[PDB]
Structures are given as structure tokens and as C-alpha cells.
Amino acid sequence: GSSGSSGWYHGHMSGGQAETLLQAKGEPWTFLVRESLSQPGDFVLSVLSDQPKAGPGSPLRVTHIKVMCEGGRYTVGGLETFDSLTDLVEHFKKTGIEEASGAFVYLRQPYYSGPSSG
């Protein structure tokens, strides 16, 4: 067949874009890694919160968090760090990220680009 382990790394993508792809999935706690735009060694962790914009039918909200980088490592407005998006996300997939506002983002399953059915 074909050897290749695809994770949750998309790459080229724009903010307004991710929102669409995510909201389209219609799946709560749907995280996805993507490479910022012409950003200097930076990343972004998008997640589709289970909280709807209005009610039962609106496109789930999208939490955009900039993932800084410290000499290879990564951090989120915190003093802590992580080997890479893997160690970071993973550690967050069990705990979760807290938003100054007062919300806790959850990452149960990533976001893959490539359906099976038509």
C-alpha cells in the first residue's frame, strides 16, 4: 500500500480558514495544528468548542490560540514549555487550556483532511 503516519498537522492555512474547516466538521473538542502565515517560527492551536454561537444549529465556536516557540520548544502565554506540538497538545488533551474569559478548551480528537464516503 503506502507508508505514512498522518497526524494533526495541516500547515498552510489562514485564520478565517481554520474556522470554516472546523465549524464544518461539527465536532466538539476538535483540535487541529496548522502553520501560521509567514509567521516567524510560530504556530496555532485551533479547537472547536462544544459551545454553539447561538443554539442547536449554529457553527460551534473556534478557539484560536497562538503557540509561541522557545528554541524549538513551544508555550502558550505560560512559563512552561513542551518539546513540540505533540508534547504540548497531548498534555493539553488530558488537562485542557484555560481562557482568561473563563472557558476550558478540550481536545478529544484532532481534525483530519480526507473523508472516505462521498
Binding site: 485564520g15 478565517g16 502558550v76 512559563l79 512552561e80 481562557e99 474569559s101 478548551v105
Partner: peptide
């Protein structure tokens, strides 16, 4: 009218 960008939900650790 163009999507200038998207807001980023602040965090706790950070001020």
C-alpha cells in the same frame, strides 16, 4: 469588506 483576521481567546497564565 475582508476578513482582516480572527481574535485569539486570551489565556490564564498570561496577564
Amino acid at each position: 469588506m475582508d476578513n482582516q483576521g480572527v481574535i485569539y481567546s486570551d489565556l490564564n497564565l498570561p496577564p
